[PDB]
Homo-oligomer: A and B are copies of this chain.
Amino acid sequence: HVGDLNRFDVVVFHANKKEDYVKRIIGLPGDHIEYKHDKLYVNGQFVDEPYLETYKKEIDGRQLTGDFKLEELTKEKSVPPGYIFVVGDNRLGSWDSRHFGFVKADTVVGKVDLR
């Protein structure tokens, strides 16, 4: 492989920039997710999110999580088998499944014990 390379050649090379990310599971396989007016609905049922209270407090009456129905962001109406839908607690500053879609479950390397 190096034999075909010459000094001063301009080359394209591939680099595998692996990275670990930390997010909260909101949807498991089969779940429909909707946010409306800062409230989470999983399969149409409201679910309280106490871990977001501090983030909501900090933004003074403003909405923390933008409204969406899962199918408006992913084109799939439920989390696909083998995948999860994750969202960061720091909603306004988090890149998550709202942006990059579903995460394959077998890429999860650990669970966090939050203290």
Contact = CB atoms under 8 A, between A and B. Distances in A.
Interface of A: 1-2, 5-29, 31, 42, 82-84, 86, 103, 105-112, 114
A51 to B, nearest CB: 8
Interface residues of A, dominant DSSP: strand
Contacts of A22: 10-12
Nearest to A11: B108
Nearest to A50: B8
A108 B25 contact: no
Given A5-B25, A6-B25, A7-B27, A14 B107 contact: yes
17 contacts: A1-B105, A2-B28, A2-B29, A2-B105, A5-B25, A5-B105, A6-B28, A8-B24, A10-B22, A10-B25, A11-B22, A11-B24, A11-B86, A13-B21, A14-B18, A14-B19, A15-B103
Given A82-B2, A84-B2, A9 B21 contact: no
Contact of A112 (B10, B17, B26, B83): B10
A6 B111 CA distance: 10
